[PDB]
Amino acid sequence: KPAAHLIGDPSKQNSLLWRANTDRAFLQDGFSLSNNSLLVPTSGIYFVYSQVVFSGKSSPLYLAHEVQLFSSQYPFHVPLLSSQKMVYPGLQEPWLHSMYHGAAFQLTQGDQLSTHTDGIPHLVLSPSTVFFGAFAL
Amino acid sequence: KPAAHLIGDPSKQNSLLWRANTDRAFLQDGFSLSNNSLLVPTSGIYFVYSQVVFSGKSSPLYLAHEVQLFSSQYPFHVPLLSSQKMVYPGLQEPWLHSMYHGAAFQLTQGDQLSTHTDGIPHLVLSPSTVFFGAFAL
Amino acid sequence: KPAAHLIGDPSKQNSLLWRANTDRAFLQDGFSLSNNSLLVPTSGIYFVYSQVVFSGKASSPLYLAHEVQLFHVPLLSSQKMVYPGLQEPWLHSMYHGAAFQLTQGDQLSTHTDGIPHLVLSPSTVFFGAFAL
Amino acid sequence: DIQMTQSPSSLSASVGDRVTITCRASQAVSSAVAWYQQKPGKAPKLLIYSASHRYTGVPSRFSGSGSGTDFTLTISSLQPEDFATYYCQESYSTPWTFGQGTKVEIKRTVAAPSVFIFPPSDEQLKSGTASVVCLLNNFYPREAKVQWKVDNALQSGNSQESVTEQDSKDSTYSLSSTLTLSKADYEKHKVYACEVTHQGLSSPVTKSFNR
Amino acid sequence: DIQMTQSPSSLSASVGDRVTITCRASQAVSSAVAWYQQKPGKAPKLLIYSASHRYTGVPSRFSGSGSGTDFTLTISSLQPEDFATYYCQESYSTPWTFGQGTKVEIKRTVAAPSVFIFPPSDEQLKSGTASVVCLLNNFYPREAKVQWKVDNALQSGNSQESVTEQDSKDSTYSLSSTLTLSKADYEKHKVYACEVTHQGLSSPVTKSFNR
Amino acid sequence: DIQMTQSPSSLSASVGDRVTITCRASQAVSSAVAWYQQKPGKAPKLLIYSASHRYTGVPSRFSGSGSGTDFTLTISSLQPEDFATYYCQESYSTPWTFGQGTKVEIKRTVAAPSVFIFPPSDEQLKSGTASVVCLLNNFYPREAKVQWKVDNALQSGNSQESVTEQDSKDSTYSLSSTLTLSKADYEKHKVYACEVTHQGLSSPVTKSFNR
């Protein structure tokens, strides 16, 4: 059974570039990355999940993080999983927001799972706090 | 292998009606809806998950979402997965609260999965934000 | 195919002791507890999940955390940091899960901070895993 | 609920013929449709589930297609034992409403009936009523005509018929007409005829007995 | 910890009998229960895991049921190579406590023991110690009682016993018992008796000697 | 991108030898590595995927090992038909870079070549050019030297060689040398010679014709 669990590269801090080549991250039975996307190995149902954590501290700060499926038609990107938060100005204490979700999706071979994030500078890059994963049912 | 992923009906806005007949919704290998419940197709272990998102802009406002298993006993429903949040009056900005959870459960054939929700009007009814789903292990 | 769903003992309220012997909780096909840790029955890939919920009613900040360790290395982590001047009661819920390659005899356990503030019921505080 | 509108209501085809049956669902319904086959006086048999999946044991000539809202059961080579009433069933919602059924009859080369006439039993005649029975045996098509003649005076409203279902080997019918009258009226007449008109007979056959 | 209380501790059965062994747990324990077979001088053998699942190559006359607290092993038709001790074991928690075992032994008819008494040898008396032996021979069932009297005064804590396994022919037991006391105390007294109580004995048998 | 550095570029081993080939990756790559086998003028064959898994119908002498960064194809007992370029490939990222290949040659006992010479065809002399052809047949090793003497005067830049691939049975090679020259210059001379040097010949073999 195909499975993959991805992790952020902490060496970037201004990008969320996924990897699978450490302790705690992996590709298995056919998964593969193509330009920061995860590539569905065969058609079938897949549980897909992803977690992020932001922290910190004029205008409102928009946080967001989405698991996407690349498509050929307009949009080019349909959202499978979505979360937003919005941290505001006058906060006398440091903040910390955490987004987790996962669901089952029928996918086909060669489909592309990517993630888009807003508030990347605020991400908490560690193996247990920011991840992207998928496995075949 | 049985699996189902359910979506809310946007044409309702006062009730949370699960449906499986659209894009990004499905029944597979025996799942079936019965009066807004999910019918467990055979006995075995299932991963059961759900997500909701609430949003808005005198008295406190109570939000809650729960994955229930119908029972013959009393109070006829036993809680499998539960979350609350409590959004209060004097908020100078719009709010948005999100609730996710999933776990493995031993169910038998004919069991009925449903969800009780508190705060229905404030639900964000879109496929990537409000869903209910289960699959066989 | 192995699977476990563990649940808190509410007869403790100052320790979070897991059990799989009630309604809604179980061990299937090889799992076992050993001193509050889930023992991995065979080597392979598992999905591991946990949820907790803290609550209070409001001098110094209060640190909340919940973690799924590999008995110490964190697999799943979360924090929150509730502060003093809160004119209304509070409630923070934490959930996460993911796939991990585990070997036979690996020990899944959980650390928690702010244990007194936990909300112990079957549907609010749990910890479980299943083989893929 | 969800309504299932199966078409056509019935159909007739010969052995070898490709038979297509349609089912249209009131809503969109995924592939959550099943097909059953029921021979009279017996329980339905599962034929197809999940729109296209053939239930185990079901021969290859049975196949199911369709998705969303239009569904189709197809028998490619209709067989002499394939006559039955086929139902579609939506499997998505509850209750699991069935289509109204489609009755399939098998077409066959014409076959003349074999006529047999049975007089009243001696022990029934002590009961004060006489039952005379005529038997049309192994014919096709179904349409036959039975005339009851009593001393050549033909009879009107005192006879009842019944037909078997088509044989699963030879695809033929059988008829049983029962002329009934009081012993009082049976003692009055001498000649009891049974006259059969059919498409395989080139001229009506009469079977009779003297009382 | 978790306690596993097997019952009965032993049971006598015959071939083709249905044998039911129970195991009751101190906690609820999911279904995390196993069963093992053990013959003397050999390691245990896995029969059943997960309460009801049979380990590979285990014959189907073996089965397990039960959930929560009451678990049972059941041999449907006993076979001559099934006479062993059966252990249940909780697999839920650590350590993985075993029950104390049930011994399945061979049923046969009641058989009174035949009693023999042996005085100390003379060469043993040179050692300063005196062993008196009582032999109970070829009896059934196993429950036998031995009383040592020394000049009609009965002894308490100076005897050791030992019983054989069911004989490989008549399935009987045999018990040895050894009163053991100094050459000093041995000379003080004259009459040494050995009183046996058994189920096959209608009144108690006393064997004795004078020194 | 990622780079896949295979080594050695080329090796030579006898039949039944254990052959071992390495691939070092530019990054860590999980176990996402595949191995292919390519015989000349044919598409690659998949041997191993996922570092160690053998694709179906690949014989058991091919094995793959390695993790993270240093990977290894192993042929336990080399067969005369296993001569090929072997490619490793990273399956982790895109594009899925292959390594540069490893030419596995088979080592054999030495075998002197059989020499044959061919004059120019009469129909080709009409064209105004004369090709002379020398064949060296079924030799080993590949290293051979062909000299062209025209009237004992050796030629320089007017011949071309081409060699076949190792035979799949006897593991030999064959070479074709083609001395090409104008019809004019062909008829100025009489003796056309072909002088072959090879390890299998203790003394160089010349083969020639007159015109």
Beta bridge partners of F133: F118, F178
Q: Do domains E1-108 and E109-211 have the same CATH topology?
A: yes
Is F148 within 8 Å of F154 (Cβ atoms)?
yes
State the Cα–Cα distance between residues D159 and D154, nearest whole angstrom.
11
Q: Mark yes or no for CB contact A83/B98 under 8 Å.
A: yes
- Which amino acid appears at position E109 of this protein? T
Coil vs helix vs strand at E18 = coil
Find the DSSP H helices in D111-192.
Answer: 122-125, 183-186
Is F77 within 8 Å of F16 (Cβ atoms)?
yes
Q: Mark yes or no for CB contact B101/C51 under 8 Å.
A: yes
- Decide if A85 touches C, using CB distance below 8 A: no
Q: Phi and psi (nearest 5°) for E184?
A: -50, -70
Choosing among D27, D49, D91, D92, which should be mutated to test the B contact, i.e. which has the most B CBs within 10 A?
D92
What residues of chain B lie within 8 A of the CB of C91, using their CB?
A: 84-86
State the Cα–Cα distance between residues B96 and D24, nearest whole angstrom.
42
Going through chain D in order, the beta strands assigned E by DSSP cover 4-7, 10-14, 19-25, 33-38, 45-49, 53-54, 62-67, 70-75, 84-90, 102-107, 114-118, 129-139, 145-150, 153-154, 159-160, 173-182, 191-197, 205-210
A25-40: buried (b, 16+ CB within 10 Å) or exposed (e) per residue? bbbbbbbbbeeebbbb
Is A55 within 8 Å of A46 (Cβ atoms)?
no
- Contacts (Cβ under 8 Å, ≥6 apart) of F113: F136, F137, F138, F139, F144, F174, F175, F196, F198, F200, F201, F205
- Contacts (Cβ under 8 Å, ≥6 apart) of A103: A47, A48, A49, A80, A81, B5, B49, B51, B131, B133
DSSP secondary structure string, E23-39? Answer: EEESS-BTB-EEEEEE-
Instruction: Please identify which residue in the block is written with the tokens 């003349």.
Output: D112
- DSSP letter assigned to residue E165: P
Q: What angle do CA B8, B14, B19 make, to 5 degrees?
A: 20
State the Cα–Cα distance between residues D32 and D67, nearest whole angstrom.
8
Sequence spans of domains, chain E? 1-108, 109-211
- Decide if C29 touches E, using CB distance below 8 A: yes
What residues of chain B lie within 8 A of the CB of A71, using their CB?
A: none
Coil vs helix vs strand at C115 = helix
Q: What angle do CA D141, D144, D149 make, to 5 degrees?
A: 160
- Decide if C45 touches A, using CB distance below 8 A: yes
Q: How do beta strands D33-38 and D10-14 pair?
A: unpaired
What residues of chain A lie within 8 A of the CB of C97, using their CB?
A: 49, 100, 102
What's the gap in Å between the CA of B34 and the closest CA on chain D?
5
Give the nearest partner residue to E27 out of C21, C26, C28, using CB atoms. C21
Instruction: Determine if the peptide bond prior to B75 is cis (ω within 30°).
Output: yes
Q: Which of residues 15-74 of D touch B (CB under 8 A)?
A: 27-30, 32, 50
- CB-based burial label for B64 (10 Å; 0-12, 13-18, 19+): middle
Q: Residue B36, by phi and psi: left (phi above 0), alpha (psi -120 to 50) or beta?
A: left
Tokens of E185: 């105390």
- Contacts (Cβ under 8 Å, ≥6 apart) of C81: A93, A94, A96, C61, C62, C63, C64
Is C81 within 8 Å of A94 (Cβ atoms)?
yes
- Which amino acid appears at position F65 of this protein? S
- Contacts (Cβ under 8 Å, ≥6 apart) of F163: F142, F173, F174, F175, F176
Is A38 within 8 Å of A131 (Cβ atoms)?
no
State the Cα–Cα distance between residues F210 and B128, nearest whole angstrom.
88
Tokens of B123: 């639900």
Choosing among C27, C35, C107, which should be mutated to test the E contact, i.e. which has the most E CBs within 10 A?
C27
- CB-based burial label for D30 (10 Å; 0-12, 13-18, 19+): buried
Nearest alpha-carbon partner for B26 in E167, E207, F75, D68: D68
Instruction: Count CB neighbours of D196 within 10 A.
Output: 23
Q: What angle do CA F158, F160, F166 make, to 5 degrees?
A: 165
- Contacts (Cβ under 8 Å, ≥6 apart) of E69: E24, E25, E27, E28, E29
State the Cα–Cα distance between residues C53 and C88, nearest whole angstrom.
17
Q: What is the CA radius of gyration of chain D?
A: 23
Size of interface B-D (CB pairs under 8 A): 26
- Contacts (Cβ under 8 Å, ≥6 apart) of F190: F151, F210, F211
**Chains touching F by CB (3 or more pairs below 8 Å):** A
Up-side HSE of residue A51: CA atoms within 13 Å toward CB?
Answer: 26
- DSSP letter assigned to residue B122: G
Cα separation values, F33 from C1, F3, F18, F87, F120, Å: 29, 12, 21, 10, 53
- CB-based burial label for E152 (10 Å; 0-12, 13-18, 19+): exposed
Interruption sites in chain A after residues (C→N beyond 2.5 Å): 57
Up-side HSE of residue A92: CA atoms within 13 Å toward CB?
Answer: 6
CATH number at residue B55: 2.60.120.40
- Contacts (Cβ under 8 Å, ≥6 apart) of F126: none
Q: Which residue of D has its CA nearest to B27?
A: D30
Q: What dihedral angle (degrees, nearest 10) is formed by the CA atoms of F118, F123, F127, F128? A: 50
Up-side HSE of residue E71: CA atoms within 13 Å toward CB?
Answer: 35
- Contacts (Cβ under 8 Å, ≥6 apart) of E78: E13, E14, E15, E16, E17, E18, E19, E61, E104
Is F71 within 8 Å of F51 (Cβ atoms)?
yes
F15-39: buried (b, 16+ CB within 10 Å) or exposed (e) per residue? eeeebebbbebeebbbbbbbbbbeb
Tokens of C25: 């909780």
State the Cα–Cα distance between residues A32 and A28, nearest whole angstrom.
9
Domain F1-108 has CATH 3.30.70.260: no
Q: What is the CA radius of gyration of chain C?
A: 15
- Contacts (Cβ under 8 Å, ≥6 apart) of E18: E74, E75, E76, E77, E78
Cα separation values, F44 from D179, F33, F41, F88, Å: 86, 15, 9, 11
State the Cα–Cα distance between residues C33 and C10, nearest whole angstrom.
18
- DSSP letter assigned to residue E124: H
- Which amino acid appears at position B125 of this protein? L
State the Cα–Cα distance between residues F118 and F137, nearest whole angstrom.
14
Up-side HSE of residue D178: CA atoms within 13 Å toward CB?
Answer: 10
- Contacts (Cβ under 8 Å, ≥6 apart) of B5: A103, A104, A105, B20, B24, B25, B26, B131, B132, B133
Q: Residue D50, by phi and psi: left (phi above 0), alpha (psi -120 to 50) or beta?
A: left
Size of interface A-F (CB pairs under 8 A): 29
Give the nearest partner residue to B5 out of A79, A85, A104, using CB atoms. A104
Tokens of E57: 């190559």
- Decide if A91 touches B, using CB distance below 8 A: no
Tokens of B53: 């998102």
Give the nearest partner residue to B80 out of C49, C53, C123, using CB atoms. C123
What residues of chain D lie within 8 A of the CB of B34, using their CB?
A: 93-94
DSSP secondary structure string, E65-118? Answer: EEETTEEEEEESS--TT--SEEEEEE-SSSS--B---EEEEE----B--EEEEE
State the Cα–Cα distance between residues C84 and C86, nearest whole angstrom.
6
Domain count, chain C: 1
Q: Mark yes or no for CB contact C33/E92 under 8 Å.
A: yes
**Chains touching B by CB (3 or more pairs below 8 Å):** A, C, D
State the Cα–Cα distance between residues D69 and C73, nearest whole angstrom.
52
Coil vs helix vs strand at A65 = strand
Coil vs helix vs strand at F184 = helix
Nearest alpha-carbon partner for A125 in A14, A4, A3, A5: A14
Coil vs helix vs strand at D186 = helix
State the Cα–Cα distance between residues F107 and F10, nearest whole angstrom.
12
- CB-based burial label for E1 (10 Å; 0-12, 13-18, 19+): exposed
Touch criterion met for B and D (3+ Cβ pairs within 8 Å): yes
Is A27 within 8 Å of A136 (Cβ atoms)?
no
Q: How do beta strands E102-106 and E10-13 pair?
A: parallel
Coil vs helix vs strand at B88 = coil
- Decide if A21 touches F, using CB distance below 8 A: yes
- Decide if A126 touches C, using CB distance below 8 A: yes
Nearest alpha-carbon partner for C80 in C97, C98, C67: C67
State the Cα–Cα distance between residues D155 and D189, nearest whole angstrom.
13
Nearest alpha-carbon partner for A134 in A61, A65, A69, A59: A69
What residues of chain A lie within 8 A of the CB of B28, using their CB?
A: 45, 106
- Decide if C128 touches B, using CB distance below 8 A: yes
State the Cα–Cα distance between residues A71 and A114, nearest whole angstrom.
11
State the Cα–Cα distance between residues A107 and D71, nearest whole angstrom.
24
Cα separation values, F47 from A10, B70, E128, F60, Å: 36, 53, 84, 10
Q: Mark yes or no for CB contact F94/A39 under 8 Å.
A: yes
Nearest alpha-carbon partner for D61 in D14, D6, D20: D20
- Which amino acid appears at position E88 of this protein? C
Cα separation values, A53 from A87, A129, D198, Å: 13, 6, 87
Q: Which residue of C has its CA nearest to E25?
A: C21
Give the nearest partner residue to E29 out of C21, C29, C39, using CB atoms. C21
Nearest alpha-carbon partner for B29 in D49, D178, D85, D16: D49
Q: Which residue of A has its CA nearest to B1?
A: A137
Q: How do beta strands B112-118 and B37-39 pair?
A: antiparallel
What residues of chain A lie within 8 A of the CB of B26, using their CB?
A: 106
* Domain F109-211: assigned CATH number: 2.60.40.10
- Which amino acid appears at position A23 of this protein? D
Q: Phi and psi (nearest 5°) for E26?
A: -75, -30
Please report which helix (H) or strand (E) contains residue B7, including its range.
strand B3-8
Nearest alpha-carbon partner for A5 in A127, A117, A137: A127
Domain holding C113, by residue range, is 1-132
Q: Which residue of B has its CA nearest to D93?
A: B33
State the Cα–Cα distance between residues D52 and D64, nearest whole angstrom.
4
Tokens of D195: 């006259």
Q: How do beta strands C3-8 and C26-28 pair?
A: antiparallel
- Decide if C32 touches E, using CB distance below 8 A: yes
Touch criterion met for C and E (3+ Cβ pairs within 8 Å): yes
Choosing among F50, F93, F94, which should be mutated to test the A contact, i.e. which has the most A CBs within 10 A?
F93
Q: What is the experimental resolution, given in Å to one decimal place?
A: 3.2
Q: Phi and psi (nearest 5°) for B44?
A: 165, -170
Instruction: Count CB neighbours of E34 within 10 A.
Output: 23
What residues of chain D lie within 8 A of the CB of B27, using their CB?
A: 30, 32, 92
Q: Mark yes or no for CB contact B96/A86 under 8 Å.
A: yes
B28 alpha-carbon distance from chain centroid: 18
Q: Mark yes or no for CB contact C45/A1 under 8 Å.
A: yes
Give the nearest partner residue to D30 out of B20, B34, B39, using CB atoms. B20
Is A85 within 8 Å of A99 (Cβ atoms)?
yes
